[PDB]
From Swiss-Prot:
It is linked to p53 is found in increased amounts in a wide variety of transformed cells. p53 is frequently mutated or inactivated in many types of cancer. The gene is Tp53. Changing A44V: Can cooperate with an activated Ras to transform fibroblasts. It comes from the Eukaryota. Binds 1 zinc ion per subunit. Forms homodimers and homotetramers. Binds DNA as a homotetramer. Interacts with AXIN1. Probably part of a complex consisting of TP53, HIPK2 and AXIN1. Interacts with histone acetyltransferases EP300 and methyltransferases HRMT1L2 and CARM1, and recruits them to promoters. Interacts (via C-terminus) with TAF1; when TAF1 is part of the TFIID complex. Interacts with ING4; this interaction may be indirect. Found in a complex with CABLES1 and TP73. Interacts with HIPK1, HIPK2, and TP53INP1. Interacts with WWOX. Interacts with USP7 and SYVN1. Interacts with HSP90AB1. Residues 179-186 are annotated as: Interaction with DNA. Keywords: Acetylation, Activator, Apoptosis, Biological rhythms, Cell cycle, Cytoplasm, Cytoskeleton, Disease variant, DNA-binding, Endoplasmic reticulum, Isopeptide bond, Metal-binding, Methylation, Mitochondrion, Necrosis, Nucleus, Phosphoprotein, Repressor, Transcription, Transcription regulation, Tumor suppressor, Ubl conjugation, Zinc. This is Cellular tumor antigen p53. It is found in: Cytoplasm; Nucleus; Nucleus, PML body; Endoplasmic reticulum.
Amino acid sequence: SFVPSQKTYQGNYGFHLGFLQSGTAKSVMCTYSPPLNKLFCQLAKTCPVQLWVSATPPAGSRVRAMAIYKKSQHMTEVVRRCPHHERCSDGDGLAPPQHLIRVEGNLYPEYLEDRQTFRHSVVVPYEPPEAGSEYTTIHYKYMCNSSCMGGMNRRPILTIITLEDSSGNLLGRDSFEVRVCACPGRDRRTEEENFR
């Protein structure tokens, strides 16, 4: 499958991502590492992701989330949930069972499959920040740990977030690596130490 672009592009609206500082306590369900530009999260737990812009994009703007494998040998393979998780009864009535990335806390998600590449993505309308806020938050959930294919260790993934207009045209792009794991706080500390 043709590999989607992962090139960061702030664009005309200075679009980029942000993440709350969550620390590395073993109780943390989701934590982001700036040095690794990597999100560590527990299976099916909500992950707040921040959207920042220098100016509000036009009406009808949309935000798409798509996962792609990080290893070159895996890049052309569509990221899907493991057969077991897909068969698991955890559906919310909105997301097809095969989708790895889901949105929580948004009334308007659209779960899509590209007719050519077969890649999945989930899109929600872009909304400006709430009063007193400089960013907008979208809550994502990763519904599979890829345990059936060697886990995140063998099958690391990246999430590509794109700001788009109502017709699907690119307005901005950013991305981050994601590791679904048992103890996010522990994994981050270990990987950051290893990085050093």
